[PDB]
Amino acid sequence: EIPLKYGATNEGKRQDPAMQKFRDNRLGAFIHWGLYAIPGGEWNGKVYGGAAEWLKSWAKVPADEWLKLMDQWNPTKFDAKKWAKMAKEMGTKYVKITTKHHEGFCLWPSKYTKYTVANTPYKRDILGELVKAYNDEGIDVHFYFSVMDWSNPDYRYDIKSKEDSIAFSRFLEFTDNQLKELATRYPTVKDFWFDGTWDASVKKNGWWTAHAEQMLKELVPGVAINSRLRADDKGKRHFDSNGRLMGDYESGYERRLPDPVKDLKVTQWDWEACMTIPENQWGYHKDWSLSYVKTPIEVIDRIVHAVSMGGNMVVNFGPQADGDFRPEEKAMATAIGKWMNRYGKAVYACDYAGFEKQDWGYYTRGKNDEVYMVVFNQPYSERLIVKTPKGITVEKATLLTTGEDITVVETTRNEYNVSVPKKNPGEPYVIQLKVRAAK
C-alpha cells in the first residue's frame, strides 16, 4: 500500500447527475480539425500513409513552416448549425472537439499564443460557434486538449537539466492559462479529454496533472476529466501505483475494445472508447483507399460492444479544410442515425447486464432492468442462447421494433433458447427481455 499525494481521488464511480449524464449519453462523435486538414496527408508531393494529423511529424516539417498553414485557413463552407444538425441526425448525444492538437493551433482565439483562429483569414472563434450550435441542439460538448504542443518552444519531452525544468514550468503555466481560458470562456463544457501526456516530462510532474484536474473541477461544476491526463507521484499513468483509476473515467481504449469474456474488470469503472473510420486517420486524409474503411455495421457493432461493457463510444470525423464533411462521413453518420433511431433504446442510458457473453451479439441493460439482446450474428439453429445468472429467469421476449412476442424455451437450469423472429430482420436487431430476480 504505497502512499501518494497525486493518485486517485474518486473511490468508485461518480454518481452525481453530471456524471450520470456523461454516462447515459453513451454515443458521441469526435471532431479532429486543425491545420493538418489543409495538406490532408500530403506534403511536397509525397502522400504519407500515417495519421494525417501527425503529418508535421511524418514529413519532418519545422514548426515555423507548418504553422504558416494558418495563412490558408479559410473554411468557407463551415457552418456550425449544419455540423450540429449532422450530429443530431447521427444520434450522438455529445461531441468531443479538438480545441488544440499537438500542432498547437487553437480553434478558439486564445490570448496566450498567436497560433489561433484569430490570426487566419477566417478570424472567427470556431470553437465558440460549435459550442453554441451543438448546445442549441441539446448536445453536450467535450474538449479534447493536447498537452504536448509542437508550437511552444518551452515544451520539453523530458527534464534533463535545471534549464529544462525552468522552461517546462513556464510551459505548464501557459497550459494552465489556456485551460482556465477554455473553462471560463465556455462554461457549458462538460468534459476535458487530455492527450499528448505520455512524455517523461509529464510523467515526472504528476502533481501538475492532479492540479489541472482540481483546477478545472473548481472552475466547471460537475466537469469530467479523462484518465489519460493523470500521472501519480511515481509517474504511473491512468491508474495510480495502488491500481486505482485517476480521473473520472478510463480513456485508453483507442481503436481497440475490451474483450467481452476476459476484460469484465472494466465494468467497475466509467470508461470511454474512441475510434476511427479508416484504420488510423483522425484528421482529414485525402486518400482513404490506403487502409481498410469500416462499414456502418462494423461501427455499430463497436458502439454496442462498448455499451454492453459499461462504456461510451466516440466515433471520429476529420472535416475537410473547407469546413464541410467528406461523403463517406456523411453516409456513415446517416447510416448510424437510421439504426439508432430504430434501436437506440438498447444503447442510450444502458449498461452492462451481467450475463455471460453469447455469440449472437451483446446484451445491454436499461434503466428499468430491461435486458436487450442486440443480435449481430444470426444462428442457423434459429435459436439464440441465453444463459442467466443465478436466480434470474426470463419471463418474456419481445421484438423491439414490432412488439411481437418471441418464444422462449427453457433448455437447462439457467439456460434458454430465445427464438429468432419469424421474419429475418435483415440487419442487427433487438429483442427485449423481461427478467425476474428471485427474492
Side-chain angles (χ1 to χ4, degrees), residues 202-213 215-233:
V202 182
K203 285 190 201 189
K204 289 167 165 142
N205 282 282
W207 66 274
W208 178 78
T209 76
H211 146 72
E213 176 180 9
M215 172 186 80
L216 288 169
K217 281 178 173 176
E218 283 166 27
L219 288 169
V220 186
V223 77
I225 300 292
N226 67 336
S227 66
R228 186 166 313 189
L229 169 62
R230 295 278 283 100
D232 72 356
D233 315 40

Short mmCIF file of all heavy atoms in Angstrom, two decimals, residues 202-234, unseen atoms left out:
data_model
loop_
_atom_site.label_atom_id
_atom_site.label_comp_id
_atom_site.label_asym_id
_atom_site.label_seq_id
_atom_site.Cartn_x
_atom_site.Cartn_y
_atom_site.Cartn_z
N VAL A 202 5.95 14.98 -18.47
CA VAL A 202 4.67 14.99 -17.79
C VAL A 202 4.65 13.93 -16.70
O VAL A 202 4.16 14.21 -15.59
CB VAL A 202 3.48 14.78 -18.78
CG1 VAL A 202 2.16 14.85 -18.04
CG2 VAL A 202 3.50 15.83 -19.85
N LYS A 203 5.16 12.74 -17.00
CA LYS A 203 5.23 11.64 -16.02
C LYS A 203 5.95 12.06 -14.74
O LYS A 203 5.59 11.67 -13.64
CB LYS A 203 5.97 10.43 -16.61
CG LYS A 203 5.19 9.60 -17.62
CD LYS A 203 5.97 8.32 -17.91
CE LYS A 203 5.57 7.69 -19.23
NZ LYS A 203 6.16 6.35 -19.43
N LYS A 204 6.99 12.88 -14.92
CA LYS A 204 7.74 13.44 -13.79
C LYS A 204 7.02 14.54 -13.04
O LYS A 204 7.48 14.96 -11.98
CB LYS A 204 9.12 13.93 -14.25
CG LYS A 204 10.07 12.79 -14.60
CD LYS A 204 11.32 13.26 -15.34
CE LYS A 204 12.38 12.17 -15.32
NZ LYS A 204 13.11 12.09 -16.60
N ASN A 205 5.90 15.02 -13.57
CA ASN A 205 5.18 16.12 -12.97
C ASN A 205 3.76 15.74 -12.70
O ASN A 205 2.82 16.45 -13.05
CB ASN A 205 5.30 17.32 -13.86
CG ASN A 205 6.65 17.99 -13.70
OD1 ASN A 205 6.86 18.70 -12.74
ND2 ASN A 205 7.57 17.76 -14.63
N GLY A 206 3.63 14.59 -12.06
CA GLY A 206 2.36 14.06 -11.65
C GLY A 206 1.52 15.09 -10.96
O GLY A 206 0.31 15.20 -11.24
N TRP A 207 2.15 15.86 -10.07
CA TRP A 207 1.48 16.87 -9.26
C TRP A 207 0.69 17.83 -10.13
O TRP A 207 -0.42 18.27 -9.76
CB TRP A 207 2.52 17.69 -8.40
CG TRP A 207 3.39 18.48 -9.27
CD1 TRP A 207 4.53 18.07 -9.88
CD2 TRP A 207 3.13 19.79 -9.74
NE1 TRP A 207 5.02 19.06 -10.69
CE2 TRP A 207 4.17 20.13 -10.62
CE3 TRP A 207 2.09 20.70 -9.52
CZ2 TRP A 207 4.23 21.36 -11.27
CZ3 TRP A 207 2.14 21.92 -10.17
CH2 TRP A 207 3.21 22.25 -11.03
N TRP A 208 1.25 18.18 -11.28
CA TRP A 208 0.61 19.11 -12.17
C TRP A 208 -0.72 18.51 -12.76
O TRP A 208 -1.73 19.21 -12.85
CB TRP A 208 1.55 19.49 -13.32
CG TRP A 208 0.85 20.38 -14.20
CD1 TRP A 208 0.62 21.72 -14.00
CD2 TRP A 208 0.10 20.02 -15.36
NE1 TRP A 208 -0.18 22.22 -15.00
CE2 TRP A 208 -0.51 21.20 -15.85
CE3 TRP A 208 -0.11 18.82 -16.03
CZ2 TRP A 208 -1.30 21.21 -17.00
CZ3 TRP A 208 -0.89 18.83 -17.19
CH2 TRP A 208 -1.46 20.02 -17.66
N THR A 209 -0.67 17.22 -13.11
CA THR A 209 -1.84 16.55 -13.65
C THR A 209 -2.95 16.59 -12.64
O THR A 209 -4.11 16.87 -13.00
CB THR A 209 -1.55 15.10 -14.14
OG1 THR A 209 -1.41 14.16 -13.06
CG2 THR A 209 -0.35 15.08 -15.03
N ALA A 210 -2.64 16.35 -11.38
CA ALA A 210 -3.68 16.35 -10.33
C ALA A 210 -4.21 17.75 -10.12
O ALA A 210 -5.40 17.95 -9.85
CB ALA A 210 -3.14 15.77 -9.03
N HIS A 211 -3.31 18.72 -10.25
CA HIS A 211 -3.67 20.12 -10.05
C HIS A 211 -4.61 20.58 -11.17
O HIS A 211 -5.58 21.30 -10.96
CB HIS A 211 -2.38 20.96 -10.00
CG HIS A 211 -2.51 22.32 -10.60
ND1 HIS A 211 -3.22 23.34 -9.98
CD2 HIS A 211 -2.03 22.84 -11.75
CE1 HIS A 211 -3.18 24.42 -10.75
NE2 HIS A 211 -2.47 24.14 -11.83
N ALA A 212 -4.29 20.16 -12.38
CA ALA A 212 -5.10 20.52 -13.53
C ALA A 212 -6.52 19.97 -13.36
O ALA A 212 -7.49 20.64 -13.62
CB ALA A 212 -4.45 20.01 -14.80
N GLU A 213 -6.62 18.74 -12.90
CA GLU A 213 -7.90 18.13 -12.63
C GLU A 213 -8.71 18.97 -11.61
O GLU A 213 -9.86 19.30 -11.86
CB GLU A 213 -7.72 16.69 -12.16
CG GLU A 213 -9.03 16.04 -11.78
CD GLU A 213 -8.90 14.62 -11.31
OE1 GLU A 213 -7.78 14.12 -11.09
OE2 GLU A 213 -9.98 14.00 -11.13
N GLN A 214 -8.07 19.29 -10.46
CA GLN A 214 -8.74 20.01 -9.36
C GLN A 214 -9.07 21.42 -9.80
O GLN A 214 -10.17 21.91 -9.51
CB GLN A 214 -7.92 19.99 -8.05
N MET A 215 -8.17 22.04 -10.57
CA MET A 215 -8.38 23.40 -11.04
C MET A 215 -9.64 23.49 -11.92
O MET A 215 -10.45 24.41 -11.78
CB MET A 215 -7.13 23.85 -11.79
CG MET A 215 -7.25 25.17 -12.52
SD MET A 215 -5.76 25.50 -13.49
CE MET A 215 -6.01 24.53 -14.95
N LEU A 216 -9.79 22.53 -12.83
CA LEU A 216 -10.91 22.55 -13.76
C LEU A 216 -12.19 22.18 -13.06
O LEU A 216 -13.22 22.80 -13.31
CB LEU A 216 -10.64 21.65 -14.95
CG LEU A 216 -9.57 22.20 -15.92
CD1 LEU A 216 -9.13 21.16 -16.94
CD2 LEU A 216 -10.08 23.40 -16.67
N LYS A 217 -12.10 21.25 -12.12
CA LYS A 217 -13.28 20.88 -11.36
C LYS A 217 -13.83 22.05 -10.49
O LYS A 217 -15.05 22.20 -10.34
CB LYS A 217 -13.01 19.64 -10.53
CG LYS A 217 -13.09 18.37 -11.41
CD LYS A 217 -12.79 17.10 -10.64
CE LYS A 217 -13.07 15.91 -11.53
NZ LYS A 217 -12.70 14.65 -10.86
N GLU A 218 -12.94 22.91 -10.00
CA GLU A 218 -13.33 24.13 -9.29
C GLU A 218 -13.95 25.17 -10.23
O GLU A 218 -14.90 25.83 -9.88
CB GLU A 218 -12.14 24.75 -8.56
CG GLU A 218 -11.78 24.03 -7.27
CD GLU A 218 -10.41 24.45 -6.73
OE1 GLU A 218 -9.95 25.57 -7.00
OE2 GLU A 218 -9.78 23.65 -6.01
N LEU A 219 -13.43 25.28 -11.45
CA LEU A 219 -14.00 26.21 -12.42
C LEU A 219 -15.30 25.77 -13.13
O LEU A 219 -16.09 26.63 -13.57
CB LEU A 219 -12.95 26.53 -13.48
CG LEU A 219 -11.81 27.41 -13.01
CD1 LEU A 219 -10.70 27.45 -14.04
CD2 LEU A 219 -12.32 28.83 -12.75
N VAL A 220 -15.52 24.46 -13.29
CA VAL A 220 -16.64 23.94 -14.04
C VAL A 220 -17.35 22.88 -13.23
O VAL A 220 -16.97 21.70 -13.21
CB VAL A 220 -16.20 23.36 -15.39
CG1 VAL A 220 -17.41 22.94 -16.21
CG2 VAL A 220 -15.41 24.37 -16.20
N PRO A 221 -18.38 23.30 -12.50
CA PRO A 221 -19.06 22.29 -11.66
C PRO A 221 -19.50 21.01 -12.41
O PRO A 221 -20.13 21.10 -13.45
CB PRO A 221 -20.28 23.05 -11.08
CG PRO A 221 -19.95 24.49 -11.22
CD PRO A 221 -18.97 24.65 -12.37
N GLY A 222 -19.16 19.86 -11.86
CA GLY A 222 -19.56 18.56 -12.42
C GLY A 222 -18.77 18.12 -13.66
O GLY A 222 -19.02 17.03 -14.19
N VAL A 223 -17.80 18.92 -14.09
CA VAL A 223 -16.97 18.57 -15.24
C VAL A 223 -16.29 17.21 -15.06
O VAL A 223 -15.95 16.78 -13.93
CB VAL A 223 -15.93 19.65 -15.55
CG1 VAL A 223 -14.77 19.58 -14.58
CG2 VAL A 223 -15.41 19.54 -16.96
N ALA A 224 -16.15 16.48 -16.18
CA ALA A 224 -15.48 15.17 -16.20
C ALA A 224 -14.08 15.37 -16.73
O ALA A 224 -13.83 16.26 -17.52
CB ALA A 224 -16.24 14.18 -17.10
N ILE A 225 -13.16 14.52 -16.29
CA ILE A 225 -11.72 14.62 -16.68
C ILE A 225 -11.21 13.19 -16.95
O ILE A 225 -11.41 12.30 -16.11
CB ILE A 225 -10.89 15.21 -15.53
CG1 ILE A 225 -11.39 16.63 -15.15
CG2 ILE A 225 -9.41 15.24 -15.86
CD1 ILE A 225 -11.15 17.70 -16.21
N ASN A 226 -10.60 12.99 -18.10
CA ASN A 226 -10.19 11.62 -18.52
C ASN A 226 -8.93 11.14 -17.79
O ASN A 226 -8.13 11.93 -17.29
CB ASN A 226 -10.00 11.46 -20.02
CG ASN A 226 -8.83 12.24 -20.59
OD1 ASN A 226 -8.39 13.23 -20.01
ND2 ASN A 226 -8.33 11.79 -21.75
N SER A 227 -8.80 9.83 -17.72
CA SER A 227 -7.69 9.20 -17.05
C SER A 227 -6.35 9.50 -17.72
O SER A 227 -5.30 9.50 -17.05
CB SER A 227 -7.90 7.69 -16.99
OG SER A 227 -7.86 7.08 -18.27
N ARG A 228 -6.37 9.73 -19.02
CA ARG A 228 -5.16 9.92 -19.82
C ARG A 228 -4.35 11.13 -19.38
O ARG A 228 -3.15 11.22 -19.65
CB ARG A 228 -5.51 10.02 -21.29
CG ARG A 228 -4.29 10.07 -22.19
CD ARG A 228 -4.51 9.83 -23.69
NE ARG A 228 -5.36 8.67 -23.97
CZ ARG A 228 -5.57 8.16 -25.19
NH1 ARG A 228 -4.93 8.67 -26.26
NH2 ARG A 228 -6.40 7.12 -25.34
N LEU A 229 -5.02 12.10 -18.78
CA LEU A 229 -4.33 13.26 -18.15
C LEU A 229 -3.33 12.84 -17.10
O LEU A 229 -2.30 13.48 -16.95
CB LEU A 229 -5.34 14.18 -17.44
CG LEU A 229 -4.78 15.29 -16.52
CD1 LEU A 229 -3.94 16.26 -17.33
CD2 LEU A 229 -5.89 16.00 -15.79
N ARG A 230 -3.70 11.84 -16.32
CA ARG A 230 -3.19 11.75 -14.98
C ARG A 230 -1.96 10.84 -14.84
O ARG A 230 -1.88 9.73 -15.40
CB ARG A 230 -4.30 11.35 -14.02
CG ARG A 230 -5.39 12.42 -13.92
CD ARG A 230 -5.04 13.58 -12.97
NE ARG A 230 -5.25 13.10 -11.62
CZ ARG A 230 -4.30 12.68 -10.78
NH1 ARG A 230 -3.01 12.73 -11.10
NH2 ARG A 230 -4.66 12.20 -9.60
N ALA A 231 -0.96 11.38 -14.15
CA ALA A 231 0.19 10.60 -13.64
C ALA A 231 0.24 10.79 -12.13
O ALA A 231 -0.10 11.87 -11.59
CB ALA A 231 1.47 11.05 -14.28
N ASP A 232 0.65 9.76 -11.41
CA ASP A 232 0.79 9.90 -9.94
C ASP A 232 2.23 10.35 -9.57
O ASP A 232 3.07 10.62 -10.47
CB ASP A 232 0.36 8.60 -9.21
CG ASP A 232 1.34 7.44 -9.38
OD1 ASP A 232 2.35 7.53 -10.13
OD2 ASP A 232 1.09 6.40 -8.72
N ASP A 233 2.49 10.38 -8.27
CA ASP A 233 3.82 10.71 -7.70
C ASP A 233 4.97 9.90 -8.33
O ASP A 233 6.07 10.42 -8.48
CB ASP A 233 3.85 10.44 -6.19
CG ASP A 233 2.62 10.95 -5.45
OD1 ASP A 233 1.49 10.83 -5.98
OD2 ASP A 233 2.77 11.46 -4.33
N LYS A 234 4.73 8.65 -8.74
CA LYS A 234 5.78 7.76 -9.27
C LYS A 234 5.81 7.77 -10.78
O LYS A 234 6.62 7.06 -11.39
CB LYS A 234 5.68 6.31 -8.73
#
